[PDB]
Amino acid sequence: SKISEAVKRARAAFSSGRTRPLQFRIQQLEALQRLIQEQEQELVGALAADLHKNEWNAYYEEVVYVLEEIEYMIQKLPEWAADEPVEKTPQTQQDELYIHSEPLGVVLVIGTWNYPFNLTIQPMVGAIAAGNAVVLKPSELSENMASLLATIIPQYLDKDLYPVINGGVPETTELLKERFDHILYTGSTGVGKIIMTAAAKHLTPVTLELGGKSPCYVDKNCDLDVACRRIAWGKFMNSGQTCVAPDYILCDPSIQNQIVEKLKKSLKEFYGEDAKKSRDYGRIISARHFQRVMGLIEGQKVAYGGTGDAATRYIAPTILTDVDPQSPVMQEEIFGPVLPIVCVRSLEEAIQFINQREKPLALYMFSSNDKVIKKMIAETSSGGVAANDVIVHITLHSLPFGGVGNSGMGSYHGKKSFETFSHRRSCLVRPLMNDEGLKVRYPPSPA
Amino acid sequence: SKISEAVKRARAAFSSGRTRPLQFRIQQLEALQRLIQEQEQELVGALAADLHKNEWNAYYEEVVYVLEEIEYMIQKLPEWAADEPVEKTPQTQQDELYIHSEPLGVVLVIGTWNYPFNLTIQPMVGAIAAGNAVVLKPSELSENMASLLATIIPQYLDKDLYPVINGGVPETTELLKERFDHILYTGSTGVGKIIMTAAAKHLTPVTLELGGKSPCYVDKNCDLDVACRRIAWGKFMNSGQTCVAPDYILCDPSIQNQIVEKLKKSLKEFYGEDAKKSRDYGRIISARHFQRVMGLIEGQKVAYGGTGDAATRYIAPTILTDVDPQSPVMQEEIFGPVLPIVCVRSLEEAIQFINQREKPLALYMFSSNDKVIKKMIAETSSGGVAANDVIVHITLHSLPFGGVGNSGMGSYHGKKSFETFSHRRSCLVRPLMNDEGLKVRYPPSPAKMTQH
Ligand SMILES: *CCC(=O)c1ccccc1
Ligand SMILES: *CCC(=O)c1ccccc1
Ligand SMILES: [K+]
Ligand SMILES: [K+]
Ligand SMILES: [K+]
Ligand SMILES: [K+]
C-alpha cells in the first residue's frame, strides 16, 4: 500500500544513518524555518479557511511557537545530544558513567485540527532534533492545512524521512498497523485509548496529549477586572477550541454577577457588539461540532450570547449562569465559545469538585492570596497549572507540556521534546584490568 | 472480590491524604528496612527453596540493592519532592515558574520470579517514596517468596495502602481490570503487550521491563583472562536466570577456543569440577523451564557441560561452539546456564548482527580499544550498556535501568524511580495585577501588519 511503502522508505532512510549527524538535523530544521517564512501567506490562507483565523493570530497564537521551538532547538542541540556524565561512587571512580542519547527510529506524529500547524509541526521539530524519521498524519478535519502540508513538507524536507500521510479515520487506522518507535498523538481521551492499544501491538511508547474540562477557580476577593479579561482572552481565542481553554468557572455565588459583567465588558472590547463581524473571532471547525456546541446551550440560562449561524459555523461568545454540574455542558469538554459558571461555597468545595472529576490537562486559579494558590495546587492533580493567567504556561520552553490521567501521559516542548523522542541509554565503561576490589563478588562465597 | 476490595481500600487510603507527608513515606521505608533486617533468615530460606540461593548471594546479589535504594531515597526525598524552579524568560521574570511533583495515586507492581525479592520490593520502594499506594502482585513461580511476602509485608507496612495480591495468571488478569495510576511490570516481551493493552483501558502509564537476548561482543585484541571471568560470573549467576545476563557471545573464530578455555577455567574456580556440589550454583525455577532450557542444548556442539538432572532441576554450566544463529538456542532468550558462541568476522558484522535483531535490554562489549567501544555504542541501540563488565550497570543509583523497543519502555532506580511514580506538573504563578505588556495579545489585533 502507499502507507506501507511510505513507512518502509522512512525506516530505510533512518537505518542508513542519514539523520545521525547533528548537521543533517539542523539542515532539516533550517528548511522548516524557510518553509514558515516562504509559505507565510499560504499558512494564513489555510488557517483562515479552516478555522477563520487571520494573518495576525495565525502567527501570534500558533506559527510563532513553532519558529521559537526551531530556533531554540538548533541552539541547544549540541549540548542536549552530548553524552551526559553522571555521579560516581567510591567503587566506580575509575569508571566512566554516562547517559547516551540516541534516536528511537521512526516516530509517528498524529496531528489534530484546532491548531493544525502547531500541533503537527512543533512535535515534528522535536522528533527531527532527536534524529528520528518522522511520519506525519494531519487531521482531515482541518482540510486546507492538511492539503497544504502534503504539498509543502516534501518541498522543503527530506522526502523519504519525513512523509505526510493523507486521509481520514480509515487511513489513520491503517497507519497504526505499521511499526513505529514512538507515537505522539494529540486529540481526544477516547481516541487516545485506541492509539495506545494499537501501540501495544508493537510495544511502541506513546506521548498522549488528550482532553478534559480545565477548571478555572476564581477567588472571592481578587481583582475581577484583571482576572476576567485574562479568562475571556483564553476562553474565546480560536472560538473556544483550545485544549487548555479555561472550560468552566467555579466561583462563590457572591461574585457571579460581577464575573458576568466583567466578561461581557472584555468580550465587547475584544470583538465588538456583534462578534460575527470581528476579524479576530474564529469559527467552529465542522457542522458536527457546531451542532454539538449549540446543543450544550439548550436548557441553560444565557447571560450573554447564545445564538449561532449554522451556515458559517459562528457561535456568539456565550456565558451561562447557575449551571447544574450534571447538565450536558458540564459533562463533556466544551471546545467552543460557551462559558458556564458553577457556584461553589468555599475553596474546599472547589477542590472537592475538581478532584471528583477526571484529571484535567490544565487547572487555573485566580487569587491574590498565595496560600490559596498553594493549597489548591497541593490538593489537586492536573497536567499543568497557571495561577492568575490562562494558556501561557504551555508556551514556555522551560515548562514541559502534557497531561495526567485522562488528560494524557508524557510531555514535550523544548528540552523535553529532545528527551521524549530519544532513548536515554545508561552506559558503564570499565577498564579491562584486573581489579582486586572486584574479587569479593566471585564464587566461592565466604562462610 | 478479594482483588476488588484490596484495590478499593488502597484507593480510599490514598484519597485520605495519609501518604502526602514525607514523614509518613520515610516511616514506611524505614519499616521495609526493619523487615529486611528482622526477616533476613526467612528471606534466605525462601530464596533457597525457590532458586537454590544461599545466605551470601541472597544478600549480595539481591537484597542489598533494595537496602541501598531505601537508604538513598530516604536521604534524598525532601530534595526530590521539593517544587523545582525552572528558567525564566524576559516576559516571565516577575512570575514563578516551577515543576511540582505529586503522586499518581495507586500503583501496581507486578513482580517476576528470578529475583523475586528485588523485583517486587525495589520498584515498591520508589513508588512509596513518591507518595503512592502500592499494590503488589508477586510471581507464583517463586512460590516461597510469594507466600512469605504476603505474610510479612502487612506485618511491617500500612495494611490498606500496600496490599499483596496472591495467585497466578487468572488473578493477575482480574487485577488488571482494576483502575491504577501506573503499572510497573517485569517479565516477558509477550506479556508486556498484554499489560500495555490492559493499561490502555484506563490510560494508565506503564513501565515495562521486558526481555531479549543481551549480546556480548568480545574483541580479538582484548585480555581474554579478565574478560571471560567477568562474563562467566554474569552468565552463570542465578543459574543464568538474569534479565541482563550476557545471553550469547559474538567473537572472531580465531579466539573461540581461548574463550572456551578461559570460561571453563573460571567456571571451575567458581563452582568446582562438579557444579552440582557447589552451594553457590543455582537451580532452574520450574519443570517447565528446565525442559525448555535443556531443549536448547539439542543438536548443538557442546564444548563444556551439556547435561542436567530433571529431579533437582540442575543444569550443568554449558558452553556451545560454532552456533547457528538460526538454531533454537539463538532464537529465544535463554534464561539458563547455556552459553552459545556465535562467530563474526569483524566488529562491523557484530553491529549488523545486533541491529538485525530486537533491541536488547543490555548490550555488552569487551575491548581495550576506546574507538571500538564508542562505535558499537554509536551504531546500536539497547536499554543500557556495559563495556568490560556485565550486570553492574543496573546496580548504580545514577544509571536509570530500563529497556528500549522489545526490551521495554520507561525506567527506574534512584531519582528516576521517584520521577517515574510521580506526575511532574508544570506551574506558572503570576501576580494578579495589571501588566501593560500583556495587552499586545488581546484583540483587536493591529489592522496593519508589521515585520516579524
Ligand atoms: C493543546 C495545545 C493547543 O491547543 C495550543 C497550541 C498552541 C498554542 C495554543 C494552544
Ligand atoms: C532484571 C533485573 C535483574 O534480574 C537483576 C536485579 C538485580 C541484580 C542483578 C540482576
Ligand atoms: K441554570
Ligand atoms: K571470591
Ligand atoms: K525537586
Ligand atoms: K491589544
- Interface check for A277 against chain B (CB to CB < 8 A): the answer is no
Burial grade of B72 (CB within 10 A; 0-12, 13-18, 19 or more): middle
Q: After which residues is chain B broken (C to N over 2.5 A)?
A: none
Burial grade of A287 (CB within 10 A; 0-12, 13-18, 19 or more): exposed
Distance from CA of B196 to the nearest CA of A (A): 6
Is A428's CB within 8 Å of B386's CB?
yes
Q: How far apart are CA B108 and CA B95, in angstroms?
A: 38
CA of B58 to the centre of ligand 4 (A): 16
Nearest to A428 among B223, B233, B393 (CB): B393
Q: How far apart are CA B292 and CA B312, in angstroms?
A: 15
For chain A, the 3-state helix, strand and coil shares in percent, each to the nearest 5, are: 45, 15, 35
Burial grade of A53 (CB within 10 A; 0-12, 13-18, 19 or more): buried
Q: Starting from the CA of residue B393, give the closest ligand.
A: 2
CA of B316 to the centre of ligand 2 (A): 21
Side chain identity, residue B10:
A
Three-state SS letters, B342-354: EECCCHHHHHHHH
Q: What ranges make up the beta strands (E) of A252-370? A: 301-304, 308-309, 314-315, 318-321, 338-343, 362-366
Tally Cβ neighbours within 10 Å of residue B55.
17
Three-state DSSP at B412 gives strand
Phi, then psi, of A301 in degrees rounded to 5: -85, 120
Q: How far apart are CA B124 and CA A83, in angstroms?
A: 30
Q: How far apart are CA B429 and CA B83, in angstroms?
A: 13
Cell numbers representing residue A294 in the block: 449549540
CA distances from A100 to A128, A384, A422, B399 (A): 17, 29, 10, 11
For chain B, the 3-state helix, strand and coil shares in percent, each to the nearest 5, are: 45, 15, 35
Cell numbers representing residue B176 in the block: 488488571
Three-state SS letters, A109-154: EECCCCCCCHHHHHHHHHHHHCCCEEEEECCCCCHHHHHHHHHHHH
Burial grade of B370 (CB within 10 A; 0-12, 13-18, 19 or more): exposed
Question: Which DSSP symbol is given to A405?
Answer: G
Phi, then psi, of B109 in degrees rounded to 5: -110, 120
Q: Which residues of B401-411 are buried (b: 16+ CB within 10 A; e: fewer)?
A: bbbbbbbbbbb
Three-state DSSP at A258 gives helix
Q: Starting from the CA of residue B437, give the closest ligand.
A: 6
Q: Which of A64, A93, A383, A233 is nearest to B443 (CA)?
A: A233
Nearest CA in chain A to B272: A444
Q: How far apart are CA B76 and CA B73, in angstroms?
A: 5
Cell numbers representing residue B312 in the block: 533437582
Q: Tell me, rounded to whole angstroms, the distance of Cα B73 from its chain centroid.
A: 17
Question: Which DSSP symbol is given to A17?
Answer: T
Cell numbers representing residue B357 in the block: 535483531
Top residue of A22, A96, A203 to mutate, by most chain B CBs within 10 Å, is A203
Q: Tell me, rounded to whole angstroms, the distance of Cα B433 from its chain centroid.
A: 50
Asked whether A196 and A48 are in contact (CB, 8 A), the reply is no
What are the residues whose beta carbon lies below 5 Å from ligand 3 (ion)?
A 301, 322
Q: How far apart are CA A282 and CA A276, in angstroms?
A: 9
Q: At what angle do helices B118-129 and B22-38 cross, to 10 degrees?
A: 160
A313 contacts: CB under 8 Å, gap ≥ 6:
A283, A284, A285, A286, A287, A289, A290
- Interface check for A217 against chain B (CB to CB < 8 A): the answer is no
Is B430's CB within 8 Å of A199's CB?
no
Asked if residue A114 has its Cβ within 6 Å of ligand 1, the reply is yes
- Cis omega before residue B444 (within 30°)? yes
Burial grade of B452 (CB within 10 A; 0-12, 13-18, 19 or more): exposed
Q: How far apart are CA A367 and CA A374, in angstroms?
A: 11
Three-state DSSP at B422 gives strand
Q: At what angle do helices B143-156 and B40-51 cross, to 10 degrees?
A: 160
Q: How far apart are CA A405 and CA B182, in angstroms?
A: 9
The single residue listed with the C-alpha cell 501588566 is B435
A9 contacts: CB under 8 Å, gap ≥ 6:
A160, A163
Phi, then psi, of A249 in degrees rounded to 5: -105, 140
Phi, then psi, of B23 in degrees rounded to 5: -55, -40
Q: How many CA atoms lie within 13 A of A210 on its CB side?
A: 27
For chain A, list the domains and their CATH numbers. 3-210+408-446 (3.40.605.10), 213-407 (3.40.309.10)
